[PDB]
Amino acid sequence: RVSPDLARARARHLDWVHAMDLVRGEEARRRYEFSCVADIGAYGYPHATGADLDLCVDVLGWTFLFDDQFDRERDALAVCAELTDLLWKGTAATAASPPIVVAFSDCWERMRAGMSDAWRRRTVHEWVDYLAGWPTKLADRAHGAVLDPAAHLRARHRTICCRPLFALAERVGGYEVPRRAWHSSRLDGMRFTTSDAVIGMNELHSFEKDRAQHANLVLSLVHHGGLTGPEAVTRVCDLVQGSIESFLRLRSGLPELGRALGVEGAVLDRYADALSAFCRGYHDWGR
Amino acid sequence: FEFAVPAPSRVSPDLARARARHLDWVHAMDLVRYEFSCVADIGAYGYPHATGADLDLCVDVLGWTFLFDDQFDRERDALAVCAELTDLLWKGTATAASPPIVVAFSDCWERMRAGMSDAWRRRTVHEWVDYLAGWPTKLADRAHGAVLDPAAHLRARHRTICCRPLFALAERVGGYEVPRRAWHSSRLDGMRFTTSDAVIGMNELHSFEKDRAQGHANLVLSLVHHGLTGPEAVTRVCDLVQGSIESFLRLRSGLPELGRALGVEGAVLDRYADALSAFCRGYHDWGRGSRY
Ligand SMILES: CC(C)=CCC/C(C)=C(\F)COP(=O)(O)OP(=O)(O)O
Ligand SMILES: [Cl-]
Ligand SMILES: [Cl-]
Ligand SMILES: [Mg+2]
């Protein structure tokens, strides 16, 4: 599925990256439009329309443009610190703030609107835990060692940015998963297995680019597992397929979770639908 | 059950004074309204070179984590405490209205952050807050009552065991900060992770009989349920601990190259590695000797 409001949202988002001074110039605008990053929000949140869809598109595009920064290391680290302070303390973007910070704040003021203090606290923490992965990326690049597969995955569970994007699904879907359910290992496991699937797919999409330039799960498996490329790729495919099977087993336990905790079944089913829609959306967009 | 942790058995020589002071501190903090548990000793095992006020801080922080844990074993109160501590850490601010567990944490944190750089404070704040994040999960899972699968149990434990803030504490009381470019590397993060895995695994074995008797979560029990016989599950957990120690040592053998690649002095990396190993060995020796 794709949101029916994509055409308007795409054109608006291309103006927004220009207005935020993130994508400057005819060549950069064309490159950015060709990348179809301006569309993923409509695949990952296929029921969002209007301003909700704009927020999804802007946030997704922001994460791509943030990622582009690292590929001027002190500048990127300075951004991580300014964003951390904005999230932790509510410090405002200023005229001296770089475009990437101004644009994040523009997204975040919309994303936190209408959400409870509890949701804001857990979502702030997820944003900052995503930011915590980027110093690691820079340090690992400077080190130059091939990460072992498990260490690569621990790092990517931060930089892939799934958990803030799952929080965004609540914000645009119009609900908050009740606290007693959201913190359960059953739902955290659904977040974790969805993230594993998305990471695995992304590692395969990114393989050739990463090898030409960066860390990649396939390369780590070759180096540390003594696997051939084909064998390592099979291992990643098995990770994705096993993560989907695990997600489905957990999802079949949501009625019992609802009964045990006194939580309405509808909100649990809706949240699980959002996680699977994000995964399916990234998969379809990536093809 | 004994494991070949790569650090010698040692205890701080200042344990006697530190223990008696800590019991006075928990009373003055109005936390105990505990001595017999011997929790007041782990700090001298986990930080065997600390003395004086440095050791007191270690003992107080460790004891605080056990007394915080006791809250869960008034759930709305515990969540309100997590929220207040999170805001205190994030915003850089305890007040007269704060409950005793918050006053006591702030008492610890003001000593723990003293003399440390803004960079260290930022990463350590994040570690403290990630630990606070595990307790809503512990309360939710208790209310749910389902047997966690082994991987989910370990993911939850990696927050609540409180190893990462305690590794940061080793820098504070040791007198050094690992340079930023090395601290954030996956090489050192992997040494933190494998140390934590080993401590978790040892604790699951130490606690097995109690957890099963009292019907609480335990990795061995999760493996029986979702996997194994009792003995097979115990062997699996022992293999986890030994594999984590072996992985830590393989990572440690790369510290000279890390130091050369990053322009970081070899001495501070070895000192950090020794602190992680001393913590693991300290927990090993302490846990092997009444709580369980
Ligand atoms: C939204 C999710 C779940 C995943 C996307 C992860 C990102 C930001 C990339 F793979 C960057 O892709 P890109 O084509 O921009 O690669 P380069 O920036 O290296 O050219
Ligand atoms: Cl609730
Ligand atoms: Cl540095
Ligand atoms: Mg890009």
XYZ file of C-alpha atoms and ligand atoms in Angstrom:
602
model
C 0.000 0.000 0.000
C 0.995 3.639 -0.596
C -0.697 6.738 0.771
C -3.134 8.272 -1.779
C -1.859 11.794 -0.925
C 1.701 11.200 -2.198
C 1.707 13.624 -5.168
C 0.984 16.737 -3.087
C 3.188 15.554 -0.242
C 6.157 14.962 -2.550
C 5.991 18.441 -4.064
C 5.626 20.036 -0.639
C 8.600 18.116 0.769
C 10.870 19.162 -2.104
C 10.005 22.783 -1.263
C 10.596 22.100 2.444
C 14.156 20.758 1.973
C 14.881 23.851 -0.099
C 13.353 26.158 2.532
C 15.280 24.403 5.335
C 18.481 24.938 3.283
C 19.127 21.172 3.302
C 19.086 20.613 -0.479
C 20.483 23.654 -2.321
C 20.868 24.000 -6.044
C 19.468 22.542 -9.244
C 21.818 19.550 -9.272
C 21.236 18.621 -5.615
C 17.473 19.038 -6.007
C 17.448 16.728 -9.039
C 19.659 14.148 -7.285
C 17.440 14.241 -4.197
C 14.241 13.883 -6.237
C 15.742 10.995 -8.258
C 16.567 9.187 -4.990
C 12.824 8.860 -4.132
C 13.616 9.509 -0.495
C 10.725 11.992 -0.793
C 8.359 8.972 -1.155
C 9.284 6.532 1.597
C 7.004 8.239 4.110
C 4.017 7.294 1.958
C 5.114 3.641 1.774
C 5.978 3.301 5.469
C 2.786 5.020 6.682
C 0.307 4.036 3.968
C -2.787 5.354 5.746
C -1.335 8.806 6.498
C -2.583 11.753 4.441
C -2.324 15.527 4.547
C -0.215 17.118 7.309
C 0.363 13.741 8.994
C 1.838 12.372 5.763
C 3.934 15.540 5.354
C 5.444 14.895 8.772
C 6.289 11.297 7.867
C 7.839 12.367 4.590
C 9.812 15.191 6.220
C 11.140 13.024 9.057
C 12.171 10.188 6.753
C 13.871 12.611 4.388
C 15.607 14.264 7.346
C 17.093 10.916 8.440
C 18.505 10.406 4.941
C 19.952 13.874 4.837
C 21.437 13.444 8.321
C 23.038 10.164 7.229
C 24.543 11.971 4.209
C 26.504 14.263 6.584
C 28.745 11.451 7.773
C 29.609 10.245 4.240
C 33.985 17.678 8.837
C 33.690 15.024 11.547
C 33.783 17.620 14.332
C 30.838 19.363 12.638
C 28.716 16.210 12.662
C 29.560 15.562 16.326
C 28.637 19.151 17.163
C 25.242 18.522 15.572
C 24.709 15.386 17.652
C 25.408 17.400 20.824
C 23.130 20.306 19.849
C 20.300 17.907 18.939
C 20.790 15.962 22.170
C 20.477 19.175 24.189
C 17.393 20.305 22.237
C 15.700 16.975 22.956
C 16.819 16.594 26.594
C 16.407 20.229 27.652
C 14.089 21.797 25.056
C 16.818 24.199 23.911
C 15.771 26.117 20.823
C 17.436 26.172 17.446
C 19.044 29.574 16.929
C 20.211 31.588 13.952
C 23.662 30.049 14.434
C 22.167 26.531 14.303
C 23.029 24.579 11.114
C 20.241 23.647 8.687
C 20.093 20.044 9.861
C 19.289 21.200 13.426
C 16.733 23.818 12.305
C 15.027 21.142 10.213
C 14.986 18.568 13.009
C 13.380 21.070 15.364
C 10.785 21.868 12.685
C 9.924 18.138 12.524
C 10.045 17.623 16.282
C 7.681 20.463 17.177
C 5.082 18.822 14.910
C 5.908 15.287 16.070
C 5.571 15.972 19.803
C 2.377 18.027 19.429
C -0.655 16.375 21.033
C 1.428 13.607 22.667
C 1.620 12.921 26.394
C 4.577 13.661 28.658
C 5.118 9.898 28.960
C 5.266 9.392 25.199
C 7.573 12.397 24.855
C 9.970 10.993 27.465
C 10.340 7.577 25.839
C 10.514 9.080 22.352
C 13.158 11.668 23.362
C 15.204 8.778 24.693
C 14.831 6.852 21.397
C 15.912 9.882 19.344
C 18.962 10.372 21.525
C 19.818 6.667 21.397
C 19.723 6.957 17.613
C 22.073 9.929 17.831
C 24.372 7.893 20.112
C 25.130 5.563 17.200
C 26.849 8.205 15.098
C 29.909 8.781 17.273
C 30.376 5.006 17.074
C 30.171 5.106 13.274
C 32.860 7.798 13.105
C 35.081 6.049 15.648
C 34.758 2.722 13.832
C 35.632 4.329 10.522
C 38.743 5.884 12.084
C 39.658 2.522 13.660
C 39.280 0.670 10.320
C 38.763 -2.772 11.817
C 36.070 -5.057 10.409
C 33.327 -5.230 13.033
C 32.107 -8.619 14.110
C 28.525 -9.222 12.904
C 26.931 -8.927 16.329
C 28.708 -5.621 17.039
C 27.667 -4.306 13.624
C 24.057 -5.171 14.406
C 24.180 -3.572 17.869
C 25.387 -0.348 16.214
C 22.824 -0.439 13.402
C 19.953 -0.931 15.873
C 20.814 2.676 16.818
C 21.566 4.321 13.432
C 18.743 2.639 11.430
C 16.273 4.909 13.319
C 13.379 2.407 13.429
C 12.357 3.086 17.028
C 11.758 6.846 16.582
C 9.908 5.977 13.391
C 7.660 3.534 15.240
C 6.911 6.281 17.753
C 6.003 8.460 14.783
C 3.436 5.849 13.752
C 1.565 6.434 17.050
C 1.739 10.218 16.626
C 0.254 10.144 13.107
C -2.068 7.170 13.796
C -3.759 9.056 16.614
C -3.087 6.768 19.606
C -0.553 6.015 22.307
C -0.002 2.406 23.183
C -0.817 2.257 26.932
C 2.357 2.330 29.005
C 1.910 -1.100 30.588
C 1.728 -2.685 27.119
C 4.310 -0.511 25.324
C 7.086 -1.412 27.797
C 6.280 -5.139 27.758
C 8.844 -7.494 26.272
C 6.128 -8.745 23.919
C 5.869 -5.316 22.238
C 9.550 -4.477 22.598
C 10.229 -7.787 20.855
C 7.994 -6.729 17.994
C 9.976 -3.482 17.716
C 13.237 -5.415 17.863
C 12.288 -8.072 15.281
C 10.854 -5.444 12.915
C 14.108 -3.507 13.257
C 16.172 -6.637 12.549
C 14.174 -7.265 9.356
C 14.562 -3.673 8.140
C 18.288 -3.675 8.929
C 18.822 -6.920 7.058
C 17.029 -5.606 3.999
C 18.944 -2.342 4.203
C 22.284 -4.169 4.433
C 21.497 -5.937 1.158
C 20.331 -2.725 -0.529
C 23.480 -0.924 0.650
C 25.996 -3.701 0.008
C 27.643 -2.458 -3.176
C 27.776 1.170 -2.033
C 29.246 0.193 1.345
C 31.865 -2.088 -0.211
C 32.887 0.541 -2.780
C 33.470 3.214 -0.098
C 32.009 1.345 4.938
C 30.742 -1.230 7.422
C 28.292 -3.847 6.149
C 26.815 -6.950 7.748
C 27.609 -9.146 4.747
C 31.265 -8.110 4.817
C 31.464 -8.699 8.588
C 30.057 -12.225 8.115
C 32.580 -12.955 5.363
C 35.471 -11.685 7.438
C 34.572 -13.162 10.839
C 32.542 -16.207 9.798
C 34.823 -17.424 7.043
C 31.785 -17.366 4.761
C 31.710 -16.754 1.022
C 29.649 -13.790 -0.175
C 26.757 -16.003 -1.241
C 26.838 -17.808 2.121
C 26.931 -14.531 4.030
C 23.989 -13.192 2.011
C 22.012 -16.341 2.792
C 22.711 -15.710 6.460
C 21.274 -12.185 6.196
C 18.203 -13.449 4.328
C 17.729 -16.022 7.108
C 17.958 -13.188 9.635
C 15.188 -11.303 7.813
C 12.963 -14.367 7.398
C 13.503 -15.520 10.986
C 12.736 -12.006 12.247
C 9.453 -11.988 10.323
C 8.520 -15.430 11.723
C 9.325 -14.243 15.255
C 7.254 -11.064 14.749
C 4.311 -13.225 13.656
C 4.595 -15.476 16.726
C 4.634 -12.415 18.988
C 1.684 -10.863 17.136
C -0.418 -13.985 17.719
C 0.166 -13.391 21.448
C -1.319 -9.894 21.468
C -4.866 -10.962 22.443
C -3.413 -12.678 25.507
C -1.283 -9.594 26.299
C -4.423 -7.464 26.109
C -6.331 -9.740 28.468
C -3.454 -10.018 30.940
C -2.999 -6.238 31.146
C -6.591 -5.082 30.612
C -5.617 -3.294 27.386
C -8.037 -2.872 24.488
C -7.231 -5.311 21.702
C -7.803 -2.722 18.972
C -4.855 -0.517 19.941
C -2.484 -3.482 20.087
C -3.587 -4.747 16.685
C -3.271 -1.237 15.250
C 0.265 -0.861 16.571
C 1.312 -4.247 15.192
C -0.224 -3.265 11.826
C 1.905 -0.105 11.879
C 5.108 -2.014 12.545
C 4.388 -4.505 9.734
C 3.299 -1.675 7.395
C 6.601 0.128 7.990
C 8.585 -3.035 7.243
C 6.506 -3.897 4.168
C 6.721 -0.267 3.043
C 10.506 -0.111 3.257
C 10.686 -3.459 1.439
C 8.420 -2.306 -1.412
C 10.062 1.106 -1.675
C 13.492 -0.543 -1.794
C 12.490 -2.749 -4.751
C 30.367 -22.662 39.463
C 33.711 -20.999 38.772
C 34.849 -19.198 35.620
C 38.286 -18.077 34.427
C 37.678 -14.333 34.577
C 40.966 -12.576 33.491
C 41.520 -10.564 36.667
C 42.930 -11.554 40.078
C 40.787 -11.967 43.185
C 41.052 -8.725 45.189
C 39.033 -6.625 47.646
C 39.562 -3.014 48.589
C 41.485 -2.774 51.893
C 39.134 0.028 53.051
C 35.991 -2.165 53.097
C 35.413 -2.116 56.870
C 35.141 1.662 57.161
C 33.177 1.972 53.915
C 30.575 -0.593 54.960
C 29.828 1.107 58.298
C 29.618 4.551 56.641
C 27.287 3.248 53.932
C 24.872 1.869 56.540
C 24.789 5.346 58.106
C 24.235 6.880 54.676
C 21.218 4.689 53.831
C 19.687 5.670 57.166
C 20.426 9.375 56.649
C 18.919 9.120 53.179
C 15.783 7.593 54.773
C 16.069 4.625 52.396
C 15.903 1.861 55.033
C 13.162 2.566 57.580
C 19.699 -4.639 54.335
C 22.910 -5.010 56.333
C 22.585 -8.823 56.289
C 22.334 -8.952 52.486
C 26.069 -8.081 52.129
C 25.158 -5.803 49.222
C 27.254 -3.244 51.123
C 30.376 -5.161 49.975
C 30.068 -5.431 46.191
C 31.650 -2.024 45.707
C 34.894 -3.157 47.298
C 34.942 -6.284 45.080
C 34.002 -4.495 41.852
C 36.472 -1.619 42.362
C 39.239 -3.322 44.315
C 41.724 -0.418 44.089
C 39.293 2.240 45.319
C 39.673 3.574 48.868
C 38.290 6.385 50.994
C 35.685 8.609 49.418
C 36.081 6.971 45.998
C 35.161 3.604 47.538
C 32.272 5.191 49.466
C 30.844 6.436 46.168
C 31.096 2.952 44.673
C 29.444 1.344 47.693
C 26.684 3.999 47.798
C 25.857 3.716 44.066
C 25.792 -0.081 44.143
C 23.666 -0.086 47.291
C 21.374 2.497 45.702
C 20.778 0.168 42.726
C 19.763 -2.683 45.032
C 17.449 -0.437 47.057
C 15.983 0.981 43.835
C 15.426 -2.593 42.639
C 13.631 -3.321 45.937
C 10.925 -0.803 45.025
C 9.710 -3.159 42.333
C 9.930 -6.247 44.561
C 3.171 1.090 44.528
C 4.035 0.632 40.846
C 2.777 4.119 39.978
C 5.292 5.413 42.541
C 8.189 3.592 40.887
C 7.275 5.039 37.493
C 7.043 8.525 38.989
C 10.538 7.997 40.408
C 11.869 6.945 36.990
C 10.384 10.089 35.446
C 11.804 12.401 38.119
C 15.278 10.854 37.865
C 15.182 11.038 34.085
C 14.317 14.739 34.172
C 16.970 15.401 36.822
C 19.625 13.740 34.652
C 18.509 15.280 31.354
C 17.978 18.799 32.671
C 21.030 18.906 34.962
C 19.077 19.619 38.152
C 16.601 16.822 43.999
C 14.215 19.080 45.871
C 12.413 19.056 49.216
C 9.454 17.246 47.626
C 11.588 14.455 46.163
C 11.159 10.937 47.602
C 14.148 9.392 49.445
C 15.272 7.282 46.464
C 15.548 10.462 44.342
C 17.351 12.448 47.073
C 19.817 9.585 47.434
C 20.412 9.253 43.700
C 21.115 12.960 43.433
C 23.477 12.688 46.414
C 25.393 9.986 44.464
C 25.253 11.792 41.109
C 26.651 15.070 42.452
C 29.747 13.160 43.644
C 29.886 10.959 40.556
C 29.844 13.816 38.035
C 32.315 15.964 39.988
C 35.606 16.436 38.155
C 34.290 14.851 34.926
C 34.116 16.531 31.513
C 30.902 17.624 29.800
C 31.475 14.863 27.271
C 31.691 12.178 29.941
C 28.660 13.592 31.718
C 26.606 13.474 28.507
C 27.378 9.831 27.692
C 26.941 8.799 31.314
C 23.585 10.577 31.632
C 22.448 8.587 28.607
C 23.591 5.321 30.213
C 21.787 6.076 33.477
C 18.586 6.887 31.614
C 18.811 3.722 29.509
C 19.003 1.758 32.738
C 15.946 3.545 34.141
C 14.169 2.410 30.938
C 14.398 -1.263 31.923
C 12.269 -1.047 34.998
C 9.028 -0.136 33.318
C 9.719 -3.308 31.299
C 10.264 -5.357 34.459
C 6.945 -4.079 35.855
C 5.130 -4.653 32.559
C 6.470 -8.196 32.197
C 5.519 -9.044 35.771
C 1.957 -7.822 35.149
C 1.860 -9.762 31.881
C 3.180 -12.917 33.511
C 4.427 -14.577 30.322
C 7.676 -16.542 30.244
C 10.110 -14.476 28.195
C 12.090 -16.143 25.448
C 15.857 -16.288 26.196
C 16.833 -13.471 23.802
C 14.124 -11.144 25.120
C 15.147 -11.945 28.698
C 18.767 -11.016 27.919
C 17.754 -7.824 26.139
C 15.785 -6.728 29.213
C 18.578 -7.728 31.585
C 21.160 -5.686 29.658
C 19.346 -2.552 30.940
C 18.460 -3.472 34.527
C 21.803 -5.052 35.516
C 23.181 -1.449 35.605
C 26.612 -2.429 34.284
C 27.133 0.496 31.921
C 26.765 3.298 34.510
C 29.026 1.260 36.787
C 31.702 1.096 34.070
C 31.527 4.880 33.782
C 31.970 5.003 37.556
C 35.280 3.138 37.132
C 36.603 6.087 35.102
C 35.374 8.565 37.727
C 37.041 6.771 40.652
C 40.075 5.629 38.641
C 41.029 9.226 37.759
C 40.860 9.060 33.933
C 38.468 9.401 31.007
C 38.769 7.120 27.985
C 39.266 9.508 25.025
C 36.032 10.015 23.097
C 37.223 8.439 19.835
C 38.166 5.237 21.636
C 35.249 5.106 24.090
C 32.609 5.165 21.350
C 34.392 2.535 19.222
C 32.674 -0.794 18.780
C 35.889 -2.325 20.095
C 35.361 -0.796 23.522
C 31.570 -0.964 23.343
C 32.005 -4.692 22.672
C 34.128 -5.039 25.776
C 31.357 -3.345 27.782
C 28.785 -5.635 26.173
C 30.686 -8.891 26.746
C 31.520 -7.931 30.337
C 27.815 -7.289 30.959
C 26.839 -10.621 29.300
C 29.238 -12.482 31.578
C 27.936 -10.734 34.698
C 24.331 -11.358 33.654
C 24.980 -15.023 32.964
C 26.736 -15.547 36.272
C 23.870 -13.834 38.098
C 21.276 -16.019 36.366
C 23.123 -19.090 37.706
C 23.634 -17.630 41.175
C 19.914 -16.732 41.377
C 18.416 -19.810 39.690
C 17.254 -21.582 42.850
C 15.696 -18.437 44.345
C 13.969 -17.414 41.097
C 12.516 -20.878 40.550
C 11.463 -21.185 44.190
C 9.793 -17.773 44.165
C 8.549 -18.145 40.567
C 10.465 -15.235 39.015
C 12.017 -14.757 35.597
C 15.293 -16.567 34.941
C 17.309 -17.284 31.816
C 17.649 -20.978 32.710
C 13.881 -21.220 33.100
C 13.282 -19.398 29.803
C 15.527 -21.942 28.006
C 13.633 -24.869 29.501
C 10.310 -23.314 28.533
C 11.147 -22.099 25.018
C 14.029 -24.435 24.214
C 15.943 -28.245 27.172
C 16.253 -30.135 30.408
C 17.363 -28.249 33.479
C 20.955 -29.457 33.172
C 21.032 -28.655 29.450
C 19.790 -25.127 30.145
C 22.404 -24.638 32.890
C 25.170 -25.755 30.519
C 23.899 -23.331 27.892
C 24.163 -20.464 30.366
C 27.648 -21.562 31.458
C 28.658 -21.596 27.776
C 27.321 -18.019 27.493
C 29.545 -16.879 30.343
C 32.653 -18.641 29.062
C 32.022 -17.454 25.499
C 31.635 -13.875 26.721
C 34.927 -14.023 28.595
C 36.674 -15.471 25.537
C 35.162 -12.757 23.322
C 36.256 -10.030 25.760
C 39.812 -11.381 25.630
C 39.812 -11.456 21.821
C 38.643 -7.830 21.796
C 41.270 -6.905 24.390
C 44.004 -8.398 22.209
C 43.202 -5.680 19.625
C 43.768 -2.721 21.918
C 47.321 -1.989 20.652
C 45.998 -1.621 17.093
C 43.067 0.470 18.316
C 45.530 2.742 20.105
C 47.736 3.079 17.028
C 44.786 3.614 14.679
C 43.254 6.348 16.866
C 46.392 7.949 18.303
C 45.340 6.934 21.845
C 47.870 6.003 24.532
C 47.988 2.271 25.200
C 48.050 2.783 28.991
C 44.563 4.275 29.334
C 43.038 1.505 27.205
C 44.680 -1.198 29.334
C 43.519 0.587 32.478
C 39.952 0.641 31.179
C 40.134 -3.013 30.147
C 41.485 -3.907 33.619
C 38.558 -2.056 35.230
C 35.974 -4.022 33.220
C 37.709 -7.309 34.072
C 38.014 -6.344 37.751
C 34.311 -5.573 37.869
C 33.455 -8.944 36.308
C 35.839 -10.830 38.614
C 34.528 -8.847 41.585
C 30.930 -9.784 40.836
C 32.039 -13.381 40.252
C 33.752 -13.688 43.623
C 31.061 -11.757 45.517
C 28.140 -13.638 43.958
C 29.758 -17.007 44.583
C 29.847 -16.156 48.288
C 24.070 -15.400 51.074
C 21.434 -13.507 49.088
C 21.243 -16.577 46.841
C 14.494 4.668 6.680
C 15.243 3.381 6.866
C 14.557 2.392 7.754
C 16.424 3.128 6.315
C 17.268 4.011 5.448
C 18.717 4.099 5.968
C 19.480 5.151 5.231
C 19.319 6.562 5.726
C 20.248 4.854 4.154
F 20.429 3.577 3.772
C 20.993 5.832 3.281
O 20.637 5.500 1.939
P 21.258 6.278 0.698
O 20.728 5.812 -0.600
O 20.957 7.764 0.867
O 22.837 6.072 0.749
P 24.071 7.079 0.725
O 23.669 8.255 1.617
O 25.236 6.350 1.393
O 24.369 7.493 -0.678
Cl -0.744 1.854 31.457
Cl 38.948 11.977 21.093
Mg 21.664 9.754 1.174
